[PDB]
Design a protein around this ligand. Structure first.
Ligand code: HDD
Ligand code: HDD
Lengths: 725, 725
């Protein structure tokens, strides 16, 4: 059944996106190893050269047919082979996660830059030569496992560290705050953003009444709403967003000192987002774009890398800010508390089976290790309850830690027994302590500088038993205002556009008005611009609302913008090349090698599949058609010279350019490809963000790569409004 | 928290789409009832004027906060109010259906046109004035419960009939055959179409290697693949598709006579599908399009209506065709066996809670009633095992019939006891029979003409215990060819396009080639047109493969086409009206009056939200912006006159028309709106499919509504290649 030439099989070496069929990671990259990947070997199952069997090991002779009385007769109950095969199929599904149901995962490793023993006894942070295997799952939040990747939403960034002293799960998002203050409200907020209960619409979207109804009645939400309405809400890929733990946690060192910490992930590839029209159209054209992007970067060797960083605050400075450190709706500005680099995480192999490794992974922020501890952040405090509880249904019982991807790689022993799906066969004569019949093994371990038992930091607690929000949490507008003022002008316009779009889908007009009132508490310019888009007029009262105070003297912080401080990086990005039937082969040599030299991938597109032949007879393999792989999926578009008449009349080829133009992407036109300038209305003397020359040689590719480094051509935003695209 | 004017709350009368927020069915249409809807009253839970409580009935004072030791202190374990609330949240999800996970449902009623008691003793078909409540779920097949509606896929059409003599579930699809012959292969086929197991891509799409690998190796699949690749695979609405039971079943009359029968649903709104570009973009712009359209049609009074129809074959004619009646890859052409009309089904109320009624509903083709019976169809035979089995995990146990949506409205009594979540409290002293202690109640009932026990038709069985496919099943090409030749030239082109598009995404080129080889065994013109798009050249041998035989002398059957015989019905369709800031109210009057007379809905669109005022002071609320509700979501576009300069250079307004044009929709341009003819290159003297006049009037509306009756403008196809849209 395989073809003789063995081309059914992907090469076991790094290859760029689209070159080879994708594969299970252990087959694609058998030589990429780590302690966790190695320890999964006992459950990995081959196939080649094995007989097909039942689950009981009985070889199957005919897997095409049910047993029946007569070849046209009824199927017999004694067909155990049929019923086993159908039984397992009938029971394949398990409940999806209540939130972050949609997510894409990979294996990798972490290493600290230096020992952090002065501030934390955490073993995984003790030695730069200690490597910790990780498993990372990125996700959206609202939509089901089957929803689209490039929605507007918060993203989840969850890291499972398999340390020598326990599993540590760092379960964060791509924004430094959350929507709400106390975990008791999580079911209200989530129910409000999720599909509405009567009809289960809309999937993967905040643009509906219930969401904006809740936000309008709960101003503590406005901060994370600002983030989600910005281009933060539509990242280019999981490799180009930030990660944050949100909560203040504690580090505890061997001398018992507690230091407050907020965790950060910095993307080594830089920050980059889509624009809204492109993100939405991409949910239709490739609802798996981020999942795909991740898997292929790893197959290509473009491993996603992230730097772990810590904002660190002395215990004595707990009360030194305008906001409460325990309030998860407040960020800590980096101008006030810098991020200190701690180490590097590299994601470098895909899983083998998505269901087994990704769908069944269980992350929980209560999974800490000696050297870390909690705080009283009332959102974190409730999360600690939820993540253990939900697994009892999602993964079928209390033995979810024995599902292979979840297993510690370090020793685990205790007196816990039984439960559904129990794999470990305990030989301990004792199932209780204290016992004498096994000399009290396994034994408690006192806390200590290394390898000691967990002891909680002895924080003083003092108060009455109350259901009460701290008055210090009662401020809602200054952080939103701070984020707003830190954005570039084009970022601010995209925020205005995000609010305007979402609220336009709110059927009850009074809800729109109520959100607009809330915006007028943040910044009059924002509020007016959204109001104009909604045909709403601010009242004189709303026009006169005093802006909220700066945050400890800050009127902006540029670390809050995606783009204010360029951190571009082109490796792993992709360029569409629009071919014609007589391509100038010199243009193409110059184009492909320049891209290759910077780790930029290329996709050769035409009006059909198969091949075309260049001017000098080079045979050019076609990756996809113009309609099949639209500009949505690339970072820039290059048109080499040749017989342009071949495609000049192709509506798809023209539309390819107009869509890429509208979404602010670098375009380069060589030789007669400048005839396309008329489609995108480009002036004779040229325009910034359009590379043009007689040929693809000299500075042509360097100028294109310079545009790609800056991600998008923001200066084009005034010009795109005329284009009907 | 509600506004002053009561306008938080939807009018409880029929209203057009967008006029009111959508609502739970019993609040929207409280006067719409049937025996099943009434019987759900014991579990309906209101809310107005009630106190907020725990599930144990304890009133909550503060639903905003966890219990903590001091207002910035840790959350306490004794907070049972938080933990019940979070526990319930943490366990909301249940396993989605293995297949048909994505779906949308409604209540309604069925009734036969005349008594069928000469051919069946089934009670629900016995009396033209006896009404049977139904609950219908429409679905896709491949994607998850959060995947998009307007994918290319087969659709499911499952009807639960709550009869006086038992639940009958008629569990069909929107094409008259399935992909495979024997149930034993179902996990192989479904796994091949589903997302691939390494990376869980792609969602909701057949366009990937594993699917086309299976197809190319299993030519029995080609017939349903033809239907999937045609515009059947992308219906406009669940109201405008056909439904079929696929299998041959039996009708058994009071005298014991068996008649073989295939079941049909005929949509009274006519057959109508999208075009591919539109359908794929619509998965991004509104992934809930079909769910929404169905809910809104019901809210508006455009109740979906279907005619049940039977193809009837006497028992002595079982072998008289050149295909096997028991082969679910073969259709019975209506030219050979006509569909007899049987009754009418009306869907007239939406559910109250999607999860409780739609997600928990359980349909199963084994749920038959006396007067129906099965056949030896080897696909149907294995389905009977799977639907009972799968419910055990999906719905948590064997008491799934006690979940309120699934409960029979007729009596049910037996000796079965216990099981998880047992609701029924049995008083019977006996739990076994035979018993004396309850005088053997409840008792067996002998079979008879009405109110009788179920007895299987005593079919003769003769053969050895074999796992063997019937030789009569081993023909794969003649039904694909019949379907091909029965399609109009534009439908054939769209089929070619669908194959070409899917296969272009297959990475392994030998798989494309093998599928083209298969096409060459169906029809050369089809094989060559697919080959050309793939840059593949047919071999001499392939050009010489003899066409498969006609199906019992048939060279075409026009009933297999969506469009060859007009049957268009505009009621419930929708028109976009592109507003300007000085709308000519005389045009608007004439438009809305003619639309209203045919039950066609309108949406008023503009370049922002809020209101515009017409030339006569009429205040017009704006339903959506041009960008926010694209032409994808309407059936036609009208541009009234007025201040055209307002929108004449708006890129979104121009693009709206270019998109609707590309997708073959009727466009009407009044007065100066005729200037837009420029963006779409219409001849001065006009074009069939573009309605133009000095004003919108009687004749102008007529022309537009005639075009809408014909669904799309197929004659414009040659012209859409040039437009860059
Ligand atoms: C008390 C309820 C609750 C609250 C207040 C939070 N979550 Fe959570 N979260 C859950 C209850 C939960 C959960 C129900 O327990 C999930 C779903 C399924 C699972 O395994 O854990 C979950 C999943 C989940 C995942 C997916 C993990 C994975 O990939 O499997 C991420 C990344 C987060 N959450 C992160 C957050 C962040 C950054 C929060 C605010 C700071 C947050 N959660 C608040
Ligand atoms: C032997 C396995 C098997 C085979 C051969 C089939 N199916 Fe099936 N089908 C299932 C096993 C199944 C299932 C696993 O049992 C589902 C999923 C969960 C459930 O409740 O039923 C299902 C669900 C399902 C639904 C969704 C009902 C709902 O909305 O809940 C429809 C409409 C169909 N099927 C129709 C078909 C048709 C028309 C088939 C071929 C003629 C077919 N199935 C072959």
């Amino acid at each position: 059944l395989a073809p003789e030439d063995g081309s059914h099989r992907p090469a076991a070496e790094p290859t760029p996106p689209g070159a080879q069929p994708t594969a299970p990671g252990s087959l694609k990259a058998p030589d990429t190893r780590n302690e966790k990947l190695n320890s999964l070997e006992d459950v990995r199952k081959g196939s080649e050269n094995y007989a097909l069997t039942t689950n009981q090991g009985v070889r199957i002779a005919d897997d095409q047919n049910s047993l029946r009385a007569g070849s046209r007769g009824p199927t017999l109950l004694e067909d155990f082979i049929l019923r086993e095969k159908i039984t397992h199929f009938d029971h394949e599904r398990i409940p999806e996660r209540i939130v972050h149901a949609r997510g894409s995962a990979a294996h990798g490793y972490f290493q600290p830059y230096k020992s952090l023993s002065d501030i934390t006894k955490a073993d995984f942070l003790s030695d730069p030569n200690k490597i910790t295997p990780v498993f990372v799952r990125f996700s959206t939040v609202q939509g089901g496992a089957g929803s689209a990747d490039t929605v507007r939403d918060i993203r989840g960034f969850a890291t499972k560290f398999y340390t020598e002293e326990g599993i540590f799960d760092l379960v964060g998002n791509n924004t430094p705050i959350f929507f709400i203050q106390d975990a008791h409200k999580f079911p209200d907020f989530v129910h409000a953003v999720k599909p509405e209960p009567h009809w289960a619409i809309p999937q993967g979207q905040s643009a509906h009444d219930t969401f904006w109804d809740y936000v309008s009645l709960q101003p503590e939400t406005l901060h994370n709403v600002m983030w989600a309405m910005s281009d933060r809400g539509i990242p280019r890929s999981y490799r180009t967003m930030e990660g944050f733990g949100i909560h203040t946690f504690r580090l505890i060192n061997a001398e018992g000192k507690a230091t407050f910490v907020r965790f950060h992930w910095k993307p080594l590839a830089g920050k980059a987002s889509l624009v809204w029209d492109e993100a939405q159209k991409l949910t239709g054209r490739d609802p798996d774009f981020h999942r795909r992007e991740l898997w292929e970067a790893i197959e290509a060797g473009d491993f996603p890398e992230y730097e772990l960083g810590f904002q660190l605050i002395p215990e004595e400075d707990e009360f030194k800010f305008d906001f409460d450190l325990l309030d998860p709706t407040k960020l800590i500005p980096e101008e006030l508390v810098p991020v200190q680099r701690v180490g590097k995480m590299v994601l470098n192999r895909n899983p083998d089976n998505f269901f087994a490794e990704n769908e069944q992974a269980a992350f929980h922020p209560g999974h800490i290790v000696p050297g870390l501890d909690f705080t009283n952040d009332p959102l974190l405090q409730g999360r600690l309850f939820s993540y253990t509880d939900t697994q009892i249904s999602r993964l079928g019982g209390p033995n979810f830690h024995e599902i292979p991807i979840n297993r510690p790689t370090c020793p685990y022993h205790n007196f816990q027994r039984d439960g559904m799906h129990r794999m470990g066969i305990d030989t301990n004569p004792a199932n209780y302590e204290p016992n004498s019949i096994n000399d009290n093994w396994p034994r408690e371990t006192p806390p200590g500088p290394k390898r000691g038992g967990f002891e909680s930091y002895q924080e003083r607690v003092e108060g009455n038993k109350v259901r009460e929000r701290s008055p210090s949490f009662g401020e809602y507008y200054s952080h939103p205002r701070l984020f707003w003022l830190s954005q570039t002008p084009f970022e601010q316009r995209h925020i205005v556009d995000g609010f305007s779009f979402d609220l336009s889908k709110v059927v009850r007009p009074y809800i729109r008005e109520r959100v607009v009132d809330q915006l007028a508490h943040i910044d009059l310019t924002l509020a007016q611009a959204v109001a104009k888009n909604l045909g709403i007029e601010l009242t004189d009262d709303q026009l006169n609302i005093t802006p909220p105070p700066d945050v400890n003297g800050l009127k902006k912080d540029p670390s809050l913008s995606l783009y204010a401080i360029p951190d571009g990086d082109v490796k792993g990005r992709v360029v569409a090349i629009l071919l014609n039937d007589e391509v100038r082969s010199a243009d193409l040599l110059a184009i492909l090698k320049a891209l290759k030299a910077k780790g930029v991938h290329a996709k050769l597109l035409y009006s059909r599949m198969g091949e075309v032949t260049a001017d000098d007879g080079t045979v050019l393999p076609i990756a996809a058609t113009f309609a099949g792989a639209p500009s949505l999926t690339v970072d820039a578009v290059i048109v080499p010279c040749g017989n342009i008449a071949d495609i000049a009349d192709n509506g798809d080829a023209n539309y390819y350019l107009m869509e890429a133009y509208k979404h602010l992407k670098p375009i380069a036109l060589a030789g007669d490809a400048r005839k396309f300038k008329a489609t995108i209305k480009i002036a004779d003397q040229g325009e910034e963000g359009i590379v043009e020359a007689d040929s693809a040689d000299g500075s042509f590719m360097d100028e294109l790569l310079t545009l790609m480094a800056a991600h998008r051509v923001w200066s084009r935003i005034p010009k795109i409004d005329k284009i009907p695209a």
